[PDB]
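Good morning,

Attaching, inline, the C-alpha cells for the sequence recovery test we're adding to the shared suite. The designed sequence is right after.
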C-alpha cells in the first residue's frame, strides 16, 4: 500500500465527473475533504487510472525537471480555483475544464503528487 497514492486519488482523481462547472468544484472539494481550510487551487484528472499510472513509466511519461514526470497523452481535467477572499468555508470555486498533458511525481510506479503550477 501507498498512502500517498491513495491521497493522490482522493485529491486529484475523479473518473466520470459529468458537468464540470463551479457547483461541481464546490461539491467535490467538500466531498474530498479539501475545504478546511479551503484549498486555493486543485485539479482533478478524469478518465481511467491506468493512463495516469502509466505516466510513471516510459509508456505514458517522460522525466521532467528535478524529479517529476510529464505525460505523453492529454487528459480531461478540471481545475477548481478558490475565490471570494476568505480562506475558510463555505468555499466558493471557479471551475476551469481543460484538456492537456499533466505533471506528476511518482513513487514505486505510482503517482503521489500533482504539480499544480501548470494549472495556475
Amino acid at each position: 500500500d501507498n498512502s500517498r497514492y491513495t491521497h493522490f486519488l482522493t485529491q486529484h482523481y475523479d473518473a466520470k465527473p459529468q458537468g464540470r462547472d463551479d457547483r461541481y468544484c464546490e461539491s467535490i472539494m467538500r466531498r474530498r475533504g479539501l475545504t478546511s481550510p479551503c484549498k486555493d487551487i486543485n485539479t482533478f484528472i478524469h478518465g481511467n487510472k491506468r493512463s495516469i499510472k502509466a505516466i510513471c513509466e516510459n509508456k505514458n511519461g517522460n522525466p521532467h525537471r528535478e524529479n517529476l514526470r510529464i505525460s505523453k497523452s492529454s487528459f480531461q481535467v478540471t481545475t477548481c480555483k478558490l475565490h471570494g477572499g476568505s480562506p475558510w468555508p463555505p468555499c466558493q470555486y471557479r471551475a476551469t475544464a481543460g484538456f492537456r498533458n499533466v505533471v506528476v511525481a511518482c513513487e514505486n510506479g505510482l503517482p503521489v503528487h500533482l504539480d499544480q503550477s501548470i494549472f495556475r
